[PDB]
Amino acid sequence: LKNSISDYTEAEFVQLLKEIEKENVAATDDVLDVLLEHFVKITEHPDGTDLIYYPSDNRDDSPEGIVKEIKEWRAANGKPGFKQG
Amino acid sequence: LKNSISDYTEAEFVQLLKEIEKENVAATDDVLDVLLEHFVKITEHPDGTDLIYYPSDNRDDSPEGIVKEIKEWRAANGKPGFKQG
């Protein structure tokens, strides 16, 4: 868990997404909830966790599909995006 | 990492598969290699890691697709399968 979106590279962010995918089949919810809270906090995208559970039909339902959407929304709104690397 | 296939439930096994998916985009290979060694050791399936990188066309390319294939191969060969749970 890093403090902001600008601390993540795109690949470090899809690793966070994979951690969320793993905790989706965890026995309990405890870690999943903090991961999902964190995702909502740092991305600040209006759709929140719908990015994961309810992807746009126009958009690729994959971790790199989610990365693309966040990158584009943040760019349109003049906010800092991902770290390059 | 558990000692054998019989120690894993199907869901605990797809969590192992998700850990492998995450380490596929890791910076380095170090953890991925032990995860892949372990996968080959406990499943004892003839295809080894091809189950992950080179799935059968007849078969669903998903973590639960891989679980199905292992379960069926082990059953046909009279070996203990997954823990129920």
For B24-56, give the DSSP string: TTSSSSHHHHHHHHHHHHHH--TTTTHHHHS--
Distance CA(A42)–CA(B75), nearest Å, equals 46
Residues B69 and B13: beta-carbon distance below 8 Å: no
Distance CA(A39)–CA(B82), nearest Å, equals 33
Residues A24 and A32: beta-carbon distance below 8 Å: yes
What is the separation, in whole angstroms, between the first and last Cα of chain B?
Answer: 17
Domain membership of residue B54 as a residue range: 1-85
Across the interface, of A11, A22, A26, the residue whose CB is closest to B19 is A22
Residue type, A61: D
Specify the residue for token string 């080959």: B40
How many degrees, rounded to 5, is the angle at CA A38 between CA A36 and CA A39? 65
Running DSSP on this structure, what letter comes out for residue A28? S
Q: Is B14 on the interface with A (CB under 8 A)?
A: yes
Note the residue count of chain A. Answer: 85
Q: Is B21 on the interface with A (CB under 8 A)?
A: yes
Report the domain count for chain B.
1
- Chain A residues within 8 A of B15 when measuring between CB atoms: 22, 25-26
* CATH, residue B71: 1.10.1200.20
Number of other CB atoms surrounding residue A78 within 10 Å: 6
Q: Is B56 on the interface with A (CB under 8 A)?
A: no
Residues B59 and B75: beta-carbon distance below 8 Å: no
Running DSSP on this structure, what letter comes out for residue A83? P
Resolution (A): 1.8
What is the separation, in whole angstroms, between the first and last Cα of chain A?
Answer: 17
The approach used to solve this structure was X-ray
Residues B45 and B69: beta-carbon distance below 8 Å: yes
Q: Is A32 on the interface with B (CB under 8 A)?
A: no
Note the residue count of chain B. Answer: 85
- Chain A residues within 8 A of B25 when measuring between CB atoms: 11, 14-15, 18
Q: Is A20 exposed, middle or buried (0-12, 13-18, 19+ CB in 10 A)?
A: buried
Q: Is B31 on the interface with A (CB under 8 A)?
A: no
Residues B75 and B1: beta-carbon distance below 8 Å: no
